[PDB]
Amino acid sequence: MQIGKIIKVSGPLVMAENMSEACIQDMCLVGDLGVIGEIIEMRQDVASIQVYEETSGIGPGEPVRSTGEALSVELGPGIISQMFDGIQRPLDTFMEVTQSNFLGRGVQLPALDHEKQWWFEATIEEGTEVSAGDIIGYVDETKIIQHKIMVPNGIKGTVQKIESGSFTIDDPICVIETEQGLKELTMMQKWPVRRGRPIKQKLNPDVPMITGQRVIDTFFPVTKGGAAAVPGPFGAGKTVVQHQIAKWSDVDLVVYVGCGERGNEMTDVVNEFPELIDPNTGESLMERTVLIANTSNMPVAAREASIYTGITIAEYFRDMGYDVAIMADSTSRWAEALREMSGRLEEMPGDEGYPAYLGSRLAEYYERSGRVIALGSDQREGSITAISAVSPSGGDISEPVTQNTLRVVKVFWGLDSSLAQKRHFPSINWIQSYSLYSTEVGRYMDQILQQDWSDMVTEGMRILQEEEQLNEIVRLVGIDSLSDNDRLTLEVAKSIREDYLQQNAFDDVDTFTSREKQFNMLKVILTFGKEARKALSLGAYFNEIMEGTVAVRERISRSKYIPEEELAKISSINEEIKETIQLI
Amino acid sequence: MIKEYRTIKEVVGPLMAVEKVSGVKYEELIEVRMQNGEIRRGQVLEVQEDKAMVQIFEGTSGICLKNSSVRFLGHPLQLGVSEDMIGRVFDGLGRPKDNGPEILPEKYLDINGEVINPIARDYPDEFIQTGISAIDHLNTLVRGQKLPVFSGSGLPHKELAAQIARQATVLDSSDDFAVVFAAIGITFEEAEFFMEDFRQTGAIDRSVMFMNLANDPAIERIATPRMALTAAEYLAYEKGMHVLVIMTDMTNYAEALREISAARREVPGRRGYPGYLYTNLATLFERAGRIRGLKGSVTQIPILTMPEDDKTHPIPDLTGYITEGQIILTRELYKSGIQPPIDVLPSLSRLKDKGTGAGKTREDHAATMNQLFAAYAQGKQAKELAVVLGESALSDIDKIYAKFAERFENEYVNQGFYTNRTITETLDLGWELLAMLPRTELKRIKDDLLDKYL
Amino acid sequence: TIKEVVGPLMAVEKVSGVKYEELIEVRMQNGEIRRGQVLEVQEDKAMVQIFEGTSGICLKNSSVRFLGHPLQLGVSEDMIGRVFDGLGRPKDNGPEILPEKYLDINGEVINPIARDYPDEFIQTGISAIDHLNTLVRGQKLPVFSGSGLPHKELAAQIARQATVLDSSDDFAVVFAAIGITFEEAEFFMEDFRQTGAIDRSVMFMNLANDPAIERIATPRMALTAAEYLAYEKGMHVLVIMTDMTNYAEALREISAARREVPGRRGYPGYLYTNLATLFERAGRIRGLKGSVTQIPILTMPEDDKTHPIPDLTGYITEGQIILTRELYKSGIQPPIDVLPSLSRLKDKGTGAGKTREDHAATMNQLFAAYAQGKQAKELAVVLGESALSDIDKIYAKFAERFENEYVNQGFYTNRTITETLDLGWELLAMLPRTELKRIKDDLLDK
Ligand SMILES: Nc1ncnc2c1ncn2[C@@H]1O[C@H](COP(=O)(O)OP(=O)(O)O)[C@@H](O)[C@H]1O
Ligand SMILES: [Mg+2]
Numbered sequence A: 001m002q003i004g005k006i007i008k009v010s011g012p013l014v015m016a017e018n019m020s021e022a023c024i025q026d027m028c029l030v031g032d033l034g035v036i037g038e039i040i041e042m043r044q045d046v047a048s049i050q051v052y053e054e055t056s057g058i059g060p061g062e063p064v065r066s067t068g069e070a071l072s073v074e075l076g077p078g079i080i081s082q083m084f085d086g087i088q089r090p091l092d093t094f095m096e097v098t099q100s101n102f103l104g105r106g107v108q109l110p111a112l113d114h115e116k117q118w119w120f121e122a123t124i125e126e127g128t129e130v131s132a133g134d135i136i137g138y139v140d141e142t143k144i145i146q147h148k149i150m151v152p153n154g155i156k157g158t159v160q161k162i163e164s165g166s167f168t169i170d171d172p173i174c175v176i177e178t179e180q181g182l183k184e185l186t187m188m189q190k191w192p193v194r195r196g197r198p199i200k201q202k203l204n205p206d207v208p209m210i211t212g213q214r215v216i217d218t219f220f221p222v223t224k225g226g227a228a229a230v231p232g233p234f235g236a237g238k239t240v241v242q243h244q245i246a247k248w249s250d251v252d253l254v255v256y257v258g259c260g261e262r263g264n265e266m267t268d269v270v271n272e273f274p275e276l277i278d279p280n281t282g283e284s285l286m287e288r289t290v291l292i293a294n295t296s297n298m299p300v301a302a303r304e305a306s307i308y309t310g311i312t313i314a315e316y317f318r319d320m321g322y323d324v325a326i327m328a329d330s331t332s333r334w335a336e337a338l339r340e341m342s343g344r345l346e347e348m349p350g351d352e353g354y355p356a357y358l359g360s361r362l363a364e365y366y367e368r369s370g371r372v373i374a375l376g377s378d379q380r381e382g383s384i385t386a387i388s389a390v391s392p393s394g395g396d397i398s399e400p401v402t403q404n405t406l407r408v409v410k411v412f413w414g415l416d417s418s419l420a421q422k423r424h425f426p427s428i429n430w431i432q433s434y435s436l437y438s439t440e441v442g443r444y445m446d447q448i449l450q451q452d453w454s455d456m457v458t459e460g461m462r463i464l465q466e467e468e469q470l471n472e473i474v475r476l477v478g479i480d481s482l483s484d485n486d487r488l489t490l491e492v493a494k495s496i497r498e499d500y501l502q503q504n505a506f507d508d509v510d511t512f513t514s515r516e517k518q519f520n521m522l523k524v525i526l527t528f529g530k531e532a533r534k535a536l537s538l539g540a541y542f543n544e545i546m547e548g549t550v551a552v553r554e555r556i557s558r559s560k561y562i563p564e565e566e567l568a569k570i571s572s573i574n575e576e577i578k579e580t581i582q583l584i
Numbered sequence B: 001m002i003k004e005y006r007t008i009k010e011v012v013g014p015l016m017a018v019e020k021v022s023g024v025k026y027e028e029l030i031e032v033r034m035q036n037g038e039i040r041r042g043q044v045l046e047v048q049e050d051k052a053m054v055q056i057f058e059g060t061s062g063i064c065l066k067n068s069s070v071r072f073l074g075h076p077l078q079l080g081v082s083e084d085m086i087g088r089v090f091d092g093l094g095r096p097k098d099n100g101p102e103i104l105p106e107k108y109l110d111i112n113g114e115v116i117n118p119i120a121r122d123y124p125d126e127f128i129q130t131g132i133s134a135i136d137h138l139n140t141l142v143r144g145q146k147l148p149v150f151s152g153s154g155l156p157h158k159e160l161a162a163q164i165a166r167q168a169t170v171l172d173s174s175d176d177f178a179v180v181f182a183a184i185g186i187t188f189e190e191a192e193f194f195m196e197d198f199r200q201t202g203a204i205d206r207s208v209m210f211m212n213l214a215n216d217p218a219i220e221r222i223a224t225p226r227m228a229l230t231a232a233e234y235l236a237y238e239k240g241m242h243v244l245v246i247m248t249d250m251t252n253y254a255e256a257l258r259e260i261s262a263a264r265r266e267v268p269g270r271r272g273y274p275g276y277l278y279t280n281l282a283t284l285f286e287r288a289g290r291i292r293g294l295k296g297s298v299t300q301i302p303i304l305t306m307p308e309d310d311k312t313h314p315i316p317d318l319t320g321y322i323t324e325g326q327i328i329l330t331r332e333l334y335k336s337g338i339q340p341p342i343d344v345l346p347s348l349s350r351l352k353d354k355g356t357g358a359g360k361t362r363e364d365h366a367a368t369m370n371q372l373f374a375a376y377a378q379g380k381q382a383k384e385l386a387v388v389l390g391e392s393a394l395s396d397i398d399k400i401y402a403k404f405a406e407r408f409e410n411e412y413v414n415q416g417f418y419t420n421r422t423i424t425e426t427l428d429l430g431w432e433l434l435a436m437l438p439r440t441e442l443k444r445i446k447d448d449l450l451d452k453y454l
Numbered sequence C: 001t002i003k004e005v006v007g008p009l010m011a012v013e014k015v016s017g018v019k020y021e022e023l024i025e026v027r028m029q030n031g032e033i034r035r036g037q038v039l040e041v042q043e044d045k046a047m048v049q050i051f052e053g054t055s056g057i058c059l060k061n062s063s064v065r066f067l068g069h070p071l072q073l074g075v076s077e078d079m080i081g082r083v084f085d086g087l088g089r090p091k092d093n094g095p096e097i098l099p100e101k102y103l104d105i106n107g108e109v110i111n112p113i114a115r116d117y118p119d120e121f122i123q124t125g126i127s128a129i130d131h132l133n134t135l136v137r138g139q140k141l142p143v144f145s146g147s148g149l150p151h152k153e154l155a156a157q158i159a160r161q162a163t164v165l166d167s168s169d170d171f172a173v174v175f176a177a178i179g180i181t182f183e184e185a186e187f188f189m190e191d192f193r194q195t196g197a198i199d200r201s202v203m204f205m206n207l208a209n210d211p212a213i214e215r216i217a218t219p220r221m222a223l224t225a226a227e228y229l230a231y232e233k234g235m236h237v238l239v240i241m242t243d244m245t246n247y248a249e250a251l252r253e254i255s256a257a258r259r260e261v262p263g264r265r266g267y268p269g270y271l272y273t274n275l276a277t278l279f280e281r282a283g284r285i286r287g288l289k290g291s292v293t294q295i296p297i298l299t300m301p302e303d304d305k306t307h308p309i310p311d312l313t314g315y316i317t318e319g320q321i322i323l324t325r326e327l328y329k330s331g332i333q334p335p336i337d338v339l340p341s342l343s344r345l346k347d348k349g350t351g352a353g354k355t356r357e358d359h360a361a362t363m364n365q366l367f368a369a370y371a372q373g374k375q376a377k378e379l380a381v382v383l384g385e386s387a388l389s390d391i392d393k394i395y396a397k398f399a400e401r402f403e404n405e406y407v408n409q410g411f412y413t414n415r416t417i418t419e420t421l422d423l424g425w426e427l428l429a430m431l432p433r434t435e436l437k438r439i440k441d442d443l444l445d446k
Helices: A091-097 A214-219 A238-246 A263-275 A300-304 A306-318 A331-344 A358-366 A400-406 A438-449 A453-476 A484-501 A515-536 A542-547 A550-561 A573-583 B133-138 B157-167 B188-200 B218-237 B250-263 B277-285 B314-322 B369-388 B400-410 B423-433 C151-161 C182-195 C212-232 C244-257 C271-279 C308-314 C325-330 C359-382 C390-407 C417-428
Strands: A003-010 A013-017 A026-030 A035-043 A046-051 A063-070 A072-075 A118-122 A135-140 A146-150 A157-162 A165-167 A174-177 A182-185 A189-192 A227-231 A253-258 A289-292 A323-329 A381-390 B003-005 B008-012 B015-018 B029-033 B039-048 B051-056 B069-072 B078-081 B107-110 B149-151 B178-186 B207-213 B242-248 B297-305 B325-329 B342-349 C002-004 C009-013 C023-027 C033-042 C045-050 C063-066 C072-075 C101-104 C143-145 C171-180 C201-207 C236-242 C291-299 C319-322
Touching (some): A189 A306, A227 A238, A238 A323, A238 A381, A253 A263, A253 A306, A289 A306, A306 A323, A306 A358, A331 A381, A331 C271, A358 A400, A438 A453, A453 A515, A484 A515, A515 A542, A542 A550, B133 B342, B157 B242, B157 B297, B178 B218, B178 B250, B250 B277, B250 B314, B277 B314, B297 B314, B342 B369, C045 C244, C101 C212, C143 C151, C151 C182, C151 C291, C171 C182, C201 C212, C212 C291, C244 C271
Parallel strands (some): A253 A289, A253 A323, A323 A381, B149 B297, B242 B297, C143 C319
Antiparallel strands (some): A003 A063, A013 A046, A026 A063, A118 A165, A157 A174, A174 A182, B029 B039, B029 B069, C023 C063
16 A cells, blocks of 8 residues: 655654545554554645654654554454453453553554454345345354344345354455445444444434432433433542443443543443343343443543444444443543644634534534434344533533533433532432433333332422422521421421432442332332321321331331342331321 | 546645636535545635635545545535425435435525515515414514524423414414424434424424434534525415424524634634624524515524523524514523413514504504503512512502512413414403503503403 | 754754654854754754753854654662752762663553552541542542642652551652742752651752753653652652643643644643643552552642643542642641542542541541531621520531641641541540431440
8 A cells, every 4th residue: 555754743743745545534553663643634645644642753754554444443243341442442452462561652453353263153045135234144242142243334235155154353254246246244344433323213212221220210210212411520429320320221232431531540440340240140241341441641532532432332232233321431521632632633712622513523422322223124223322421620510511411412410519428329419400201201110010100200309399498498497487297298308318319339239229129119208208198187296206107217218228039028118107107 | 517626635624625626616516425435515615716615514534635526516505496395304405304205396596595675575564373472462473574582491492483383373364374494403302303293283284394403514504594494485485475484493503603613713703603693694584574566475483592591692692683573481480380481571573563553453452562561560670579578668559560460470471382372362361461450550541441341 | 954043942954863852962163062852853854952052052063963862761779869850860969870771751651451449548647638538559649739829848748758557668759840949949859858758769850940841851750760660669659740830831832832823721732641641650550569659739820720730630630639828828737628629549548457447437527527617607707606506616616626726737747647537536526426427336436
C-alpha cells in the first residue's frame, strides 16, 4: 500500500505527505514506533494527523501507514469476557504477551484471538438466498450465550459452500455468490464505532427491566430498550447504581464502559466482576459481560469513543436477538474528552467550552439504543438498554451534559446530596425524579402479577408527596400541631423511606430484591397504613397504636432481609398487622 | 448535461473544497458517492473562481479525495410535490418513510419559496374556533395568522398540539383544515406518539407529515420546516386548500442552527446564537397568510420549549418579535392540574381586532376581552398578598377579585386535552365564569349584556 | 545554522533526524555554551527554546549541535538525601551521582487492569486527614488551596510527619516544587534538613523565574525518580507536587510559542491529557513490591472550584482536600474544611488490623454531629439563641470545639492515629449516648 512521510511534528499534531490515497478519519500508525494517530484534515497529499500518544522522539522522515479504515471493532467469537479500552485494545493480552504491567508505546495487538479454534456449527443449507443479518450458523462461546454468525452488511447473494468445522476467526467458513462474484466470509466482521448498525424496524420499549433495586423497579422503572440518566454530586452513589444494575439486570449481555475514569476506581470493576457468580449457572459475571475499561491516562480518542465502542458491541449482540444492557460511567468524563478534542481541533466552542455538536453526539448515542427488529429473515427482536451516570459540577444539573441527556431519555434518577449524608441509599429524590415508562410498566405489572400493583405504586407516591407537604407544617408549627391522621401518614411515609426506598447494596440479601418480594414488601407497608387508618376512625388513639405495634413494625423493617425462598414470611405480616390492630 | 467532479482538493473538518469547477452556483445542491456505495447530500456554501466550498449533511467522515465523486445537481434543495402527499409520511428532506407507494412528483420546488408581495397579501380576519376559550376569547386565532405556543420541558404542549389539530375549524363554512405536521429533531418515541395519535383519530388521512429525528443530520433539521412550508404553500396556493401548519420543536431547530453556524466558524451573537436567528426564523414564519385572488390560506402554529423557563432567551424572544402573538404555558398552572395550563397574562394575539366582532360576537364577548385582562391582573395582585398575608384590604373591592380567579382557572381556563367546547359554549360558560362578582365589579361600557344573561 | 532568534525561541536550519523534544547545544560567538529543547520540527527547520535564554546571541557567528536524545534522568539509589534542580541537576553542593542508567522522563502508561486495591494506611499525623479523609497507599489525594492560603505549611507538615505504621520498609518521599518563589523553595529545603526528613527524601526544586520548559519537565523528572525507586527498588514512595497551577500556566506559554489556539479559559485543549498523564503515574501494581502515592497540590484561581485546573483534577484523583479562606481568617491550622473534602478510598485503609476498630463509626459520628452542630449555630444567630433546644445547644459548642481543638491542631503538631481517635471520643462525650450513630458495642471507648 501507500506509505506516508512525516514533514512536521508539532506537539500532538503530525503532518505527513505521500498520503493521497488516505481518507478522512482513518486510523494511522505514526513514525517508526507506529503510535496511534488519526487523520483530521487533508490537502492534496498532505494529511493532518492527531496523535493520541506521546510524540516525543518522533520527527520528519519517519513513515506513516494508514490502516485503511476508521476506528472500528473486531466482532466475532472471543469477545465475551474480555476487557478492552476505548480503541478496543486487549488489556489482558497486553499483560500476558508483553509480560509487563504497562502499555507499550506503539505496540499493536489484535482485539480477539486469531489463533484460537472455535467449533462452527453451520445451520443453513446451500442454495439459500441470504441478506444482511441472516444467521448462517453459531458458536458455543459460553455455556449459555450462543454466538450466532451473521451475514455482514453489504453482502447479498446465494450460499454456495458451507460446512461445520473447527476454524479460527481468520479461516473462511462460507462462500456467497454475489453479483460481483465469489465472496468469502469469516466468523469475524469489522464495524466503525461512529456508525450505527442497520436495523429492520425500531420499536417501542414496553417490557420493564428487573433491576432488584426497589426504588427503581417500583417508582421509576426503565424498560428493555429504554434509557436512564443518573446525575448527582460526588459520593452520591452514581457508580454503586451502575454496579448494581450491571450484575442483577434480567439481561442477556452487559457492556460496561469506563469513560473515563479514576485509576483506583477502575480497579473495582476489573476485580469484583470476575468474582461474582450466578447461583443458577455457576458462571462468572464476566462470562456475559464485555468490559470497556478506560483510565484518565488513556488516549483521548479512546476516551471519546468509549461509549461508541461499547454500544457498537451492544448492537452486535442486539442483532443476534439478545437483550443487552450498556452502562456508562461517567458520561461527564466522556464529554470532557469530547471537549478536549474540540479545543485540540481548534473549533468554535459552544456552551461552557463544549463543542457545538455536543447535543447531537448524545442524541446519536441514545438513539442507537432501543427495542428493534434485527435484520434477517427471522425478524427477531433485540434491545439495548442504556444506563448512564452523569457527573455535573457541584450537582447542578443545569449544565449542558445533563440537560442534553434528559432531552433524549425518559428516565431520570436524580441523586440528592442531603440524602447521601443520611445514609439514605440509593440517594434518589423521590419528588424530583421521574419515569415516562411508569404508566406502561404498571400495565405490564398488573397483567403478569394479576394484582392491583399500579394502584399500590400510585398510593405509595401519594403518601410520599403528602409527607413533603406535611413536613413544612412540622417546621412552621409544632409536630403536635398535626391531627392523628396526619401523624399516621408521616409514620407510613417514614416506613416507605426506611423499609423500602433505602437499600444497602453491600448486604448479602438486601443487594437484590425480585419482583415478587417487592410486591409483598410494599403490600405489608400499605397494609399497616390501611388498618391504622381504619383504627383511628373507630376511636383509637395514635399513641396507643404505636405503643402496641412495636413488635410488628420491627418485623416490617427487617422484611428487606428475608431470603428469596421464604417470601411467605413477608406475606404473613399482613395477618399479624390486622390481628394486632384489631386487638387495639 | 450531468456534472461530476472526481478530484477533491481539500477537506477540513465538515468543510470541503473542490477545484477546477465552472457553472457552479451559490446554495447549489450536491451529492457525494462514497466508495462503499453510500450517497451523501451536500450544499455549496461559497464559490470563488474555479473553486467551491461545500458542506456535507452527514459529515465528511471516511471521504477520500481521489476515490470519490462530487455530482453538482445544478439546483438548490428542492421538494417533490404532488396531489398524493396527503396521507403520507415524509423525511426531513421530503423522502417517503411510511413504506407506501412512492409518488412521481409533478415538479420540484425551491424549499426557500418566494416572498409574498405585501400588496398582494390578504390580511387575515376569518375567526378560527379552536375550542379553547383561553385562546378563542382572549388570544383569538385567525386563518393565515402565525401564532406559536411557548412551553417548557415536561409541559403538555404535545397534548395541546394534538387538541388544536382535532377541534379547530372555521365558522359558518364547509372548509376543513389540511394539516401539515413537522416534527423537528425529536426522539423516536416522541415521533411515535404523533404517528400513533394521527392514526387513531384518523387525522393521518387528511394530513402530510414531515418527520425529522434527533439523530438526523443537523442540516436536515434545518431543512425540515422549509420542506413542510413548501408543501403547505403548494397545497394552499395551487390546490386552494386552507393549510394548518404545526411545527415542534423550534428550540431544536435553533440549536441545530447554532451547531451549523459554529461548524462554518461564524462568530456567535447574543448568548452564543447566530446573528441571523431573527432573519432565519423570519423566513419561516412569514410564509403564512393569504393572497388576493387566490383561494386557500396558510396558518402556522410553531411550538417551542423555553430554556430554563426563561422568556428572555433568544429563541422565544426573537420568536415573539416575529410572530403575531404567543401562547404561554406555565408550570405553576400545570402543577394545579390545569390542562391546558395557559397563562393569559403573558399571552397575546395581534390579529384579534378584525377577528372579533365579525365572526364573533358583535361585541357580545369581544368587549369583555379587555376586562378579563385587566380584572385578572388585579385579581392576581390581590391573591398574591392575601395568601401570604392576612385579611385583604377589602372583601368587596380587593378579596372579591380573589374569588374570580381560583375557580376561573380551575374551570374557566381548564378545559381538556381530549375535550372540545364551542365558542358559544365558551361565551356561555364565560358569563357564568364570572363567579362570583357583582354588577359593581363589571366596569364595562355596556349594561345590555349584563342583564341578558347572569 | 541558526536562522532566526525570536524572543526565547530559535529557528535552526539544516535539521535532519531531529526529533521532537530533542535537546540541543548552542556554542555562542563568545564561547558561552547553552542548551535547549525542540518544541517543533519540520523538514527544513526546527523551533527550539534555550534554557538559559537567547539574550546576547549573535545570529551570524553562533553554532548549534543536536544531541540526538531528549531530557534524561541519571537514576541511582544515591538519590536519597539529595536535592536536585528541575532538570535533575545537583542543587546542594554535593558529589555528582554515578548513574545506574539514564531514563526517559515521560515514563510508561499503566494498564488499567494491572492495578491492585489500595490497601495500607498512611499516617499524615493530621486529624482532619487520617480520620475523615484517610490517605491510602497508591491513592491520589490532592489538596485544593488558594492565593494566600497556608498550603505551604501543610505541604511541609505532611512531608515531615508522614509515616507508614507499622511496616517501615523502604518508605521514601519525593518532593517536587514547580515554579515557586525562592522563599517558598528555601523554606522546604531548610525544613527537610533541620528535621532530618532529608535523610529519606528526594527533592526536585524548580523556581518561578526558571524557563517555562523547565517548569514542565519538573513533574516528569520527579515522577520518573519515584517510579524508579518504586518499581526497581521496591520502595513505598509518596510524591508531593506544588504548585500544579504553575504547571498549567507554563503549558499556556509553550502552546502560544507553537501558535496553538487556546481552549477553555485560556488553557491548551490537551490540558486534561497532561494532568492525567502525570497523576495516573501512581497506584499499587499487581506483581510489584513498591508503589507510588501522590499528593498533588494546587491553588484554585479566584477560589473557583469550576476552574479547569481543580475541575479536571477531581475527575482524575480519588477525592480532594479543601483549604478555605474562612478557616484561615479564623486562625484554624490547618484550615481544612471537612465538608467539601473527600477521600474515595478511606475505607480501604481503616478498620481493624489498620488504625483501630472504632475508626469508621466515630468518623461518621463526628461528621454528622459537626454538620448538625454547624447548622444549629445558624439558627442561634437568626433566632434568640436563648430558647434553642438544650440538646442543640451542646451541638453548637461541639462544632466550635471540633474546629478549634480538633481541626486546629497546628502546623508542627504530630498526632498518632490513636491520639486522634481518643480526642474524637472526648468530643463525642459532650453529647448524650442517645444521640450517636455508633453501635452499642462501642461502649468500650465510651
Ligand atoms: N446502595 C448503596 N448501599 C450502600 N452504600 C452506598 C450505596 N450507594 C452508595 N453508597 C456509598 O456512597 C459512596 C458513593 O460511592 P460512588 O457511587 O462512587 O459515589 P459517586 O459515584 O456518586 O461519586 C460509596 O462509597 C458507598 O459507600
Ligand atoms: Mg462515581
